[PDB]
mmCIF file of C-alpha atoms in Angstrom:
data_model
loop_
_atom_site.group_PDB
_atom_site.id
_atom_site.type_symbol
_atom_site.label_atom_id
_atom_site.label_comp_id
_atom_site.label_asym_id
_atom_site.label_seq_id
_atom_site.Cartn_x
_atom_site.Cartn_y
_atom_site.Cartn_z
ATOM 1 C CA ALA A 3 -0.137 0.313 -0.126
ATOM 2 C CA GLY A 4 0.803 3.534 0.504
ATOM 3 C CA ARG A 5 -0.606 6.741 -0.618
ATOM 4 C CA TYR A 6 0.446 8.381 -3.573
ATOM 5 C CA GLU A 7 0.237 12.308 -4.557
ATOM 6 C CA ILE A 8 -0.216 14.181 -7.461
ATOM 7 C CA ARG A 9 -1.181 17.799 -8.434
ATOM 8 C CA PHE A 10 -2.150 19.473 -11.071
ATOM 9 C CA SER A 11 -0.947 23.163 -11.682
ATOM 10 C CA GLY A 12 -1.301 25.851 -14.129
ATOM 11 C CA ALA A 13 -3.467 28.654 -14.021
ATOM 12 C CA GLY A 14 -7.506 29.387 -13.053
ATOM 13 C CA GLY A 15 -9.431 28.828 -16.042
ATOM 14 C CA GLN A 16 -7.342 25.515 -17.077
ATOM 15 C CA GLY A 17 -9.471 23.070 -15.274
ATOM 16 C CA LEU A 18 -7.562 21.745 -12.885
ATOM 17 C CA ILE A 19 -10.404 20.891 -10.717
ATOM 18 C CA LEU A 20 -12.349 18.951 -12.993
ATOM 19 C CA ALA A 21 -8.870 17.009 -13.664
ATOM 20 C CA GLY A 22 -8.515 16.337 -10.115
ATOM 21 C CA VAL A 23 -12.058 15.211 -10.086
ATOM 22 C CA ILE A 24 -11.579 12.652 -13.032
ATOM 23 C CA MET A 25 -8.317 11.173 -11.296
ATOM 24 C CA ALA A 26 -9.986 10.923 -8.230
ATOM 25 C CA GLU A 27 -12.823 9.151 -9.683
ATOM 26 C CA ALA A 28 -10.697 6.799 -12.044
ATOM 27 C CA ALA A 29 -8.875 5.533 -8.851
ATOM 28 C CA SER A 30 -12.047 4.654 -6.526
ATOM 29 C CA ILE A 31 -15.107 4.167 -8.966
ATOM 30 C CA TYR A 32 -13.227 2.535 -11.525
ATOM 31 C CA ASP A 33 -9.912 1.053 -10.312
ATOM 32 C CA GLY A 34 -11.126 0.435 -6.931
ATOM 33 C CA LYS A 35 -8.950 2.306 -5.117
ATOM 34 C CA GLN A 36 -9.461 5.400 -2.509
ATOM 35 C CA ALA A 37 -8.774 8.873 -3.248
ATOM 36 C CA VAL A 38 -9.334 11.993 -1.969
ATOM 37 C CA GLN A 39 -9.334 15.551 -4.338
ATOM 38 C CA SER A 40 -9.326 19.226 -2.989
ATOM 39 C CA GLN A 41 -8.267 22.473 -3.657
ATOM 40 C CA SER A 42 -7.116 25.294 -1.447
ATOM 41 C CA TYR A 43 -7.750 29.231 -1.473
ATOM 42 C CA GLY A 44 -6.201 32.074 0.026
ATOM 43 C CA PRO A 45 -4.830 35.129 -1.371
ATOM 44 C CA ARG A 48 -7.029 34.127 -6.306
ATOM 45 C CA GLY A 49 -5.053 34.284 -9.276
ATOM 46 C CA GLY A 50 -1.493 33.772 -9.821
ATOM 47 C CA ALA A 51 -0.419 29.948 -10.119
ATOM 48 C CA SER A 52 -3.003 27.546 -9.146
ATOM 49 C CA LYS A 53 -3.514 23.566 -8.265
ATOM 50 C CA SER A 54 -5.728 21.129 -7.238
ATOM 51 C CA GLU A 55 -4.590 17.781 -5.852
ATOM 52 C CA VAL A 56 -5.334 14.146 -5.281
ATOM 53 C CA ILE A 57 -4.283 11.523 -3.159
ATOM 54 C CA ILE A 58 -4.995 7.432 -4.113
ATOM 55 C CA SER A 59 -4.079 4.650 -1.774
ATOM 56 C CA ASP A 60 -4.767 1.288 -1.645
ATOM 57 C CA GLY A 61 -6.181 1.995 1.902
ATOM 58 C CA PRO A 62 -6.955 5.046 3.590
ATOM 59 C CA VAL A 63 -6.348 8.388 2.176
ATOM 60 C CA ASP A 64 -7.548 11.304 4.341
ATOM 61 C CA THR A 69 3.888 16.533 2.559
ATOM 62 C CA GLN A 70 5.678 15.893 -0.915
ATOM 63 C CA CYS A 71 4.017 15.043 -3.719
ATOM 64 C CA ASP A 72 5.221 12.471 -6.212
ATOM 65 C CA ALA A 73 3.710 13.710 -9.461
ATOM 66 C CA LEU A 74 3.373 17.453 -10.623
ATOM 67 C CA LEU A 75 1.212 18.670 -13.402
ATOM 68 C CA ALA A 76 2.519 22.538 -14.318
ATOM 69 C CA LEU A 77 0.810 23.820 -17.328
ATOM 70 C CA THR A 78 2.832 27.859 -16.830
ATOM 71 C CA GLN A 79 5.921 28.575 -15.566
ATOM 72 C CA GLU A 80 4.518 30.536 -12.627
ATOM 73 C CA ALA A 81 2.778 26.893 -11.641
ATOM 74 C CA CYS A 82 6.203 25.007 -12.089
ATOM 75 C CA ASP A 83 8.552 28.137 -10.464
ATOM 76 C CA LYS A 84 5.671 27.856 -7.412
ATOM 77 C CA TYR A 85 5.151 24.282 -7.235
ATOM 78 C CA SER A 86 7.975 22.150 -8.050
ATOM 79 C CA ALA A 87 9.713 22.420 -4.690
ATOM 80 C CA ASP A 88 7.330 20.460 -3.442
ATOM 81 C CA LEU A 89 7.665 17.529 -5.859
ATOM 82 C CA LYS A 90 9.599 14.669 -4.260
ATOM 83 C CA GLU A 91 13.064 14.353 -5.867
ATOM 84 C CA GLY A 92 12.872 11.429 -9.173
ATOM 85 C CA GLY A 93 9.050 12.302 -8.940
ATOM 86 C CA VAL A 94 7.130 12.895 -12.266
ATOM 87 C CA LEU A 95 7.662 16.252 -13.650
ATOM 88 C CA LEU A 96 4.817 17.120 -16.672
ATOM 89 C CA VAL A 97 5.061 20.338 -18.315
ATOM 90 C CA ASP A 98 3.873 22.480 -20.828
ATOM 91 C CA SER A 99 7.040 22.907 -23.222
ATOM 92 C CA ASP A 100 6.012 26.031 -24.584
ATOM 93 C CA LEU A 101 4.672 27.697 -21.742
ATOM 94 C CA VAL A 102 7.250 26.618 -19.342
ATOM 95 C CA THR A 103 10.368 27.209 -20.809
ATOM 96 C CA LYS A 104 12.375 27.836 -17.503
ATOM 97 C CA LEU A 105 13.139 23.996 -16.174
ATOM 98 C CA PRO A 106 13.664 23.770 -12.300
ATOM 99 C CA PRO A 107 16.893 23.266 -10.628
ATOM 100 C CA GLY A 108 16.533 19.728 -9.400
ATOM 101 C CA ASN A 109 16.299 15.701 -10.122
ATOM 102 C CA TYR A 110 13.094 14.964 -11.390
ATOM 103 C CA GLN A 111 11.561 12.609 -14.206
ATOM 104 C CA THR A 112 10.902 15.184 -16.677
ATOM 105 C CA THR A 113 8.205 15.040 -19.647
ATOM 106 C CA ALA A 114 8.007 18.120 -21.667
ATOM 107 C CA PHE A 115 5.189 17.934 -24.419
ATOM 108 C CA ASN A 116 2.876 20.769 -26.322
ATOM 109 C CA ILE A 117 0.056 19.775 -24.194
ATOM 110 C CA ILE A 118 -1.982 23.083 -24.750
ATOM 111 C CA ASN A 119 -1.113 23.194 -28.572
ATOM 112 C CA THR A 120 -1.868 19.858 -28.973
ATOM 113 C CA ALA A 121 -5.380 20.004 -27.576
ATOM 114 C CA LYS A 122 -5.894 23.554 -30.018
ATOM 115 C CA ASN A 123 -4.415 22.473 -33.044
ATOM 116 C CA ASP A 124 -4.317 18.411 -33.033
ATOM 117 C CA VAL A 125 -8.093 17.934 -31.509
ATOM 118 C CA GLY A 126 -9.163 21.203 -32.310
ATOM 119 C CA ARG A 127 -10.729 22.572 -28.915
ATOM 120 C CA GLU A 128 -8.244 24.712 -26.684
ATOM 121 C CA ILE A 129 -10.221 24.137 -23.282
ATOM 122 C CA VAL A 130 -9.536 20.492 -23.245
ATOM 123 C CA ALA A 131 -5.829 20.638 -23.029
ATOM 124 C CA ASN A 132 -6.681 19.459 -19.034
ATOM 125 C CA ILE A 133 -8.081 16.148 -20.868
ATOM 126 C CA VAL A 134 -4.541 16.040 -22.824
ATOM 127 C CA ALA A 135 -2.797 16.700 -19.715
ATOM 128 C CA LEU A 136 -4.862 14.055 -17.549
ATOM 129 C CA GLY A 137 -4.291 10.999 -20.639
ATOM 130 C CA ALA A 138 -0.222 12.413 -19.972
ATOM 131 C CA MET A 139 -0.413 12.316 -16.111
ATOM 132 C CA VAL A 140 -1.710 8.625 -16.428
ATOM 133 C CA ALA A 141 0.719 7.101 -18.811
ATOM 134 C CA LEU A 142 3.493 8.738 -16.554
ATOM 135 C CA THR A 143 2.454 7.660 -13.131
ATOM 136 C CA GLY A 144 0.528 4.490 -14.008
ATOM 137 C CA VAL A 145 -1.241 5.416 -10.834
ATOM 138 C CA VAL A 146 -4.619 4.239 -12.412
ATOM 139 C CA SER A 147 -5.542 1.909 -15.307
ATOM 140 C CA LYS A 148 -5.838 3.614 -18.588
ATOM 141 C CA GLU A 149 -9.382 2.062 -18.497
ATOM 142 C CA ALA A 150 -10.633 3.397 -15.322
ATOM 143 C CA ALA A 151 -8.833 7.034 -16.820
ATOM 144 C CA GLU A 152 -10.768 6.829 -19.571
ATOM 145 C CA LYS A 153 -14.028 5.714 -18.480
ATOM 146 C CA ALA A 154 -13.778 8.888 -15.807
ATOM 147 C CA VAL A 155 -12.720 11.072 -18.356
ATOM 148 C CA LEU A 156 -16.045 9.991 -20.449
ATOM 149 C CA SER A 157 -18.613 10.401 -17.718
ATOM 150 C CA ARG A 158 -17.513 13.904 -17.362
ATOM 151 C CA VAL A 159 -17.888 15.356 -20.829
ATOM 152 C CA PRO A 160 -21.562 16.163 -22.458
ATOM 153 C CA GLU A 161 -22.491 13.456 -25.101
ATOM 154 C CA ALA A 162 -21.732 16.112 -28.165
ATOM 155 C CA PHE A 163 -17.744 16.423 -27.165
ATOM 156 C CA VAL A 164 -17.481 12.855 -26.411
ATOM 157 C CA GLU A 165 -15.212 12.284 -29.310
ATOM 158 C CA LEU A 166 -13.161 15.209 -29.195
ATOM 159 C CA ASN A 167 -12.465 14.273 -25.204
ATOM 160 C CA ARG A 168 -11.525 10.553 -26.152
ATOM 161 C CA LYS A 169 -9.210 11.779 -28.577
ATOM 162 C CA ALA A 170 -7.383 14.576 -26.351
ATOM 163 C CA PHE A 171 -7.368 11.549 -23.773
ATOM 164 C CA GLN A 172 -5.436 9.063 -26.330
ATOM 165 C CA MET A 173 -3.146 11.907 -27.435
ATOM 166 C CA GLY A 174 -2.097 13.345 -24.366
ATOM 167 C CA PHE A 175 -1.302 9.479 -23.461
ATOM 168 C CA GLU A 176 0.709 8.546 -26.482
ATOM 169 C CA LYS A 177 2.832 12.048 -26.787
ATOM 170 C CA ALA A 178 3.726 11.229 -22.883
ATOM 171 C CA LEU A 179 4.824 8.043 -23.801
ATOM 172 C CA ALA A 180 6.823 9.149 -26.732
ATOM 173 C CA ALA A 181 8.293 12.282 -24.802
ATOM 174 C CA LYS A 182 9.754 11.493 -21.820
ATOM 175 C CA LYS A 183 13.383 10.179 -21.503
ATOM 176 C CA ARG B 5 -13.996 27.310 11.718
ATOM 177 C CA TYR B 6 -16.895 25.620 9.542
ATOM 178 C CA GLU B 7 -17.748 23.064 7.994
ATOM 179 C CA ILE B 8 -20.460 22.413 5.092
ATOM 180 C CA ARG B 9 -21.292 19.150 2.783
ATOM 181 C CA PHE B 10 -23.548 18.781 0.257
ATOM 182 C CA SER B 11 -24.552 15.453 -0.025
ATOM 183 C CA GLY B 12 -27.221 13.908 -2.818
ATOM 184 C CA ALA B 13 -27.106 11.768 -5.578
ATOM 185 C CA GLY B 14 -23.882 12.032 -8.029
ATOM 186 C CA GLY B 15 -24.881 14.379 -11.398
ATOM 187 C CA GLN B 16 -26.387 16.904 -8.796
ATOM 188 C CA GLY B 17 -23.494 18.931 -8.796
ATOM 189 C CA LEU B 18 -22.557 18.787 -5.449
ATOM 190 C CA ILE B 19 -19.095 19.203 -6.696
ATOM 191 C CA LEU B 20 -19.397 22.803 -8.343
ATOM 192 C CA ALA B 21 -21.650 23.905 -5.383
ATOM 193 C CA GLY B 22 -19.090 23.224 -3.136
ATOM 194 C CA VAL B 23 -16.492 25.314 -5.330
ATOM 195 C CA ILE B 24 -19.172 28.140 -5.411
ATOM 196 C CA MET B 25 -18.863 28.488 -1.907
ATOM 197 C CA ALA B 26 -15.344 27.905 -1.958
ATOM 198 C CA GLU B 27 -14.486 30.941 -4.004
ATOM 199 C CA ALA B 28 -17.134 33.139 -2.332
ATOM 200 C CA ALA B 29 -15.729 32.802 0.471
ATOM 201 C CA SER B 30 -11.859 33.431 -0.604
ATOM 202 C CA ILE B 31 -12.020 35.073 -4.032
ATOM 203 C CA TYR B 32 -15.169 37.831 -2.735
ATOM 204 C CA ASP B 33 -15.106 37.362 0.852
ATOM 205 C CA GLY B 34 -10.564 37.383 1.102
ATOM 206 C CA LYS B 35 -11.273 34.680 3.585
ATOM 207 C CA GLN B 36 -9.693 31.181 3.530
ATOM 208 C CA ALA B 37 -10.922 28.265 2.030
ATOM 209 C CA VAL B 38 -10.648 24.411 1.194
ATOM 210 C CA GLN B 39 -12.874 22.675 -1.085
ATOM 211 C CA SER B 40 -13.108 18.401 -1.424
ATOM 212 C CA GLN B 41 -14.413 14.961 -2.117
ATOM 213 C CA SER B 42 -13.548 11.607 -0.889
ATOM 214 C CA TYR B 43 -14.090 8.562 -2.424
ATOM 215 C CA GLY B 44 -14.387 4.605 -1.030
ATOM 216 C CA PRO B 45 -14.435 1.671 -2.893
ATOM 217 C CA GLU B 46 -17.273 1.572 -3.202
ATOM 218 C CA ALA B 47 -18.128 4.776 -4.965
ATOM 219 C CA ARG B 48 -20.602 4.726 -8.022
ATOM 220 C CA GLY B 49 -23.044 2.766 -5.950
ATOM 221 C CA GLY B 50 -25.084 4.873 -3.078
ATOM 222 C CA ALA B 51 -24.628 8.771 -3.650
ATOM 223 C CA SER B 52 -21.845 11.392 -3.190
ATOM 224 C CA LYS B 53 -20.687 14.054 -0.642
ATOM 225 C CA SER B 54 -18.886 17.175 -1.271
ATOM 226 C CA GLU B 55 -16.926 19.232 1.670
ATOM 227 C CA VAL B 56 -16.365 23.068 2.104
ATOM 228 C CA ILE B 57 -14.094 24.468 4.665
ATOM 229 C CA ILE B 58 -14.118 28.369 5.595
ATOM 230 C CA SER B 59 -11.786 30.091 8.043
ATOM 231 C CA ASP B 60 -11.068 33.607 9.349
ATOM 232 C CA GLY B 61 -7.703 33.179 7.925
ATOM 233 C CA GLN B 70 -18.611 16.767 12.403
ATOM 234 C CA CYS B 71 -19.273 19.894 10.111
ATOM 235 C CA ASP B 72 -21.898 22.462 10.950
ATOM 236 C CA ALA B 73 -24.064 22.313 8.028
ATOM 237 C CA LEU B 74 -25.239 19.322 5.976
ATOM 238 C CA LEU B 75 -27.648 19.350 2.579
ATOM 239 C CA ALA B 76 -29.493 16.421 1.547
ATOM 240 C CA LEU B 77 -30.619 16.355 -2.080
ATOM 241 C CA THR B 78 -31.782 12.691 -1.843
ATOM 242 C CA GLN B 79 -33.171 10.212 1.065
ATOM 243 C CA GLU B 80 -29.937 7.698 0.662
ATOM 244 C CA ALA B 81 -27.623 10.708 1.145
ATOM 245 C CA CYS B 82 -29.805 11.770 4.342
ATOM 246 C CA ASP B 83 -29.673 8.151 5.901
ATOM 247 C CA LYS B 84 -25.523 8.142 5.198
ATOM 248 C CA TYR B 85 -24.026 12.043 6.218
ATOM 249 C CA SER B 86 -27.083 12.348 8.857
ATOM 250 C CA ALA B 87 -24.954 11.307 11.358
ATOM 251 C CA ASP B 88 -21.847 12.944 10.470
ATOM 252 C CA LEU B 89 -23.920 16.293 11.094
ATOM 253 C CA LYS B 90 -23.237 18.245 14.257
ATOM 254 C CA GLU B 91 -25.852 18.553 17.603
ATOM 255 C CA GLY B 92 -28.307 21.849 16.759
ATOM 256 C CA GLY B 93 -26.337 21.797 13.288
ATOM 257 C CA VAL B 94 -27.903 23.965 10.239
ATOM 258 C CA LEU B 95 -29.617 20.580 8.344
ATOM 259 C CA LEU B 96 -31.523 21.114 4.727
ATOM 260 C CA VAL B 97 -33.366 18.711 2.511
ATOM 261 C CA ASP B 98 -35.625 18.246 -0.433
ATOM 262 C CA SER B 99 -39.223 18.066 1.612
ATOM 263 C CA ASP B 100 -39.958 15.820 -1.638
ATOM 264 C CA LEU B 101 -37.125 13.207 -1.436
ATOM 265 C CA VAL B 102 -36.519 13.405 1.800
ATOM 266 C CA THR B 103 -39.790 12.053 3.309
ATOM 267 C CA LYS B 104 -38.427 9.873 6.262
ATOM 268 C CA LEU B 105 -36.383 12.789 8.561
ATOM 269 C CA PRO B 106 -33.445 11.117 10.810
ATOM 270 C CA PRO B 107 -33.823 11.346 14.283
ATOM 271 C CA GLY B 108 -31.820 14.311 15.676
ATOM 272 C CA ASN B 109 -31.081 17.607 17.478
ATOM 273 C CA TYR B 110 -30.970 19.296 13.967
ATOM 274 C CA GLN B 111 -32.040 22.718 12.647
ATOM 275 C CA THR B 112 -34.033 21.717 10.029
ATOM 276 C CA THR B 113 -35.553 23.833 6.960
ATOM 277 C CA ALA B 114 -37.033 21.795 4.683
ATOM 278 C CA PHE B 115 -38.544 22.510 0.906
ATOM 279 C CA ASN B 116 -39.017 21.246 -2.527
ATOM 280 C CA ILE B 117 -35.424 22.118 -3.523
ATOM 281 C CA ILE B 118 -35.901 19.804 -6.969
ATOM 282 C CA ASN B 119 -38.996 20.801 -7.837
ATOM 283 C CA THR B 120 -38.151 24.502 -7.544
ATOM 284 C CA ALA B 121 -35.591 24.121 -9.825
ATOM 285 C CA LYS B 122 -37.378 22.202 -12.541
ATOM 286 C CA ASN B 123 -41.008 24.228 -11.756
ATOM 287 C CA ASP B 124 -40.575 27.242 -11.351
ATOM 288 C CA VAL B 125 -37.195 27.828 -13.058
ATOM 289 C CA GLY B 126 -37.460 25.791 -16.063
ATOM 290 C CA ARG B 127 -34.197 23.338 -15.215
ATOM 291 C CA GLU B 128 -33.752 20.782 -12.571
ATOM 292 C CA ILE B 129 -30.397 20.567 -13.389
ATOM 293 C CA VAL B 130 -29.435 24.107 -11.452
ATOM 294 C CA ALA B 131 -30.858 22.453 -8.354
ATOM 295 C CA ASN B 132 -27.485 22.460 -6.393
ATOM 296 C CA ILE B 133 -28.078 26.413 -7.143
ATOM 297 C CA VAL B 134 -31.351 26.464 -5.697
ATOM 298 C CA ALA B 135 -29.255 24.396 -2.746
ATOM 299 C CA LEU B 136 -26.630 27.043 -2.477
ATOM 300 C CA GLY B 137 -28.838 29.732 -2.366
ATOM 301 C CA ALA B 138 -30.820 28.383 0.774
ATOM 302 C CA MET B 139 -27.248 27.182 1.857
ATOM 303 C CA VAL B 140 -25.998 30.840 2.080
ATOM 304 C CA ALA B 141 -28.912 32.254 3.389
ATOM 305 C CA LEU B 142 -28.926 29.685 6.699
ATOM 306 C CA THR B 143 -25.287 29.396 7.797
ATOM 307 C CA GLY B 144 -24.683 33.480 6.782
ATOM 308 C CA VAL B 145 -20.973 31.944 6.270
ATOM 309 C CA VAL B 146 -20.648 34.147 3.159
ATOM 310 C CA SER B 147 -21.822 37.302 1.855
ATOM 311 C CA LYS B 148 -24.746 37.302 -0.139
ATOM 312 C CA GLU B 149 -22.708 39.598 -2.971
ATOM 313 C CA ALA B 150 -20.047 37.060 -3.107
ATOM 314 C CA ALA B 151 -22.009 34.052 -3.256
ATOM 315 C CA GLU B 152 -23.649 35.897 -6.120
ATOM 316 C CA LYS B 153 -20.737 36.239 -7.872
ATOM 317 C CA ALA B 154 -19.160 33.351 -7.087
ATOM 318 C CA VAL B 155 -22.388 31.949 -9.176
ATOM 319 C CA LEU B 156 -21.658 33.752 -12.186
ATOM 320 C CA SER B 157 -18.451 33.192 -13.097
ATOM 321 C CA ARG B 158 -19.166 29.437 -12.868
ATOM 322 C CA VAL B 159 -22.069 29.006 -14.436
ATOM 323 C CA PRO B 160 -22.419 28.756 -18.075
ATOM 324 C CA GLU B 161 -22.806 32.523 -18.945
ATOM 325 C CA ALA B 162 -25.565 31.361 -21.453
ATOM 326 C CA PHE B 163 -27.192 29.866 -18.258
ATOM 327 C CA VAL B 164 -26.474 32.736 -16.188
ATOM 328 C CA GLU B 165 -29.969 34.407 -15.479
ATOM 329 C CA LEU B 166 -31.544 31.153 -14.721
ATOM 330 C CA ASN B 167 -28.794 30.633 -12.341
ATOM 331 C CA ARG B 168 -29.274 33.831 -10.669
ATOM 332 C CA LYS B 169 -32.837 32.995 -10.472
ATOM 333 C CA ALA B 170 -32.207 29.695 -8.768
ATOM 334 C CA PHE B 171 -29.772 31.129 -6.813
ATOM 335 C CA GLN B 172 -32.490 33.942 -5.728
ATOM 336 C CA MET B 173 -35.044 31.853 -5.379
ATOM 337 C CA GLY B 174 -33.472 28.731 -3.014
ATOM 338 C CA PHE B 175 -32.508 31.977 -0.446
ATOM 339 C CA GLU B 176 -35.670 33.034 -0.556
ATOM 340 C CA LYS B 177 -37.761 29.830 -0.033
ATOM 341 C CA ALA B 178 -34.669 29.401 2.671
ATOM 342 C CA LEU B 179 -35.881 32.146 4.772
ATOM 343 C CA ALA B 180 -39.283 31.819 4.107
ATOM 344 C CA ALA B 181 -39.386 27.922 5.190
#
């Protein structure tokens, strides 16, 4: 057993809460684990984050993985990421990489969503596919079911595509 | 040091309502807040619960939109704690020294506003009226930033009606 913590950080309107929520429900509803999802407020602009903690057991410090969609998020949040932890950033926007030893993967998350899928707002779904690929914390099936259950029927193809592409590109971009 | 739980069936937007409370309290009221949902191995079955905590720097209030959620989390609610239920779905109340408000929250959404799926906002309006943990204007503003722009007015009415019926009940 053991708790595993992921943080999704970036900017306010990026859908970080939803990503957190999707990850939590992938683990518990679908993968049979326990999970807690949450976000703190207290000055609410600047770089922001939502958190998820998953465990084979009860899930009531340093995080194991971190998404940063903005330089600001990366600057603000990387210090918490444990050494050798998963660091996923957007490569267009996070151009200055942090000091520290991290399993670092970088790709055009936002632009994948915007240009490949053709729907910028689902960049968080791209990142979620990427985060699932890199951490292996939940099955691809669990995450896919969780993603698609939080999406409108009319946009269901685009989100599947975003998720798959995030998944694919993270695998190919990593060291 | 206030805690509020929004319970019902998954799909009723309990999470969104918690997020709104947190933002009303923090982005608009300058306070501190944390919002969260926890999930067990058995998560789909039954109901869903989200939580909000607001600071100046067992919970105090509980919303139950369904009678199952009212069976699950009722025990959790404090003594003399604010309790708010949909008087249509919760037709069997748990024993406890609760300060209770009960009306047709869902039916207010579906029958008066026109959209049943804004029930959470109706509940949210009622919650702010009772607890008084955030100013009305902060909750009204936080709602507007986080509902669909094109459903804005319906949501404003839902919040206002929940708030009204709450004080009237």
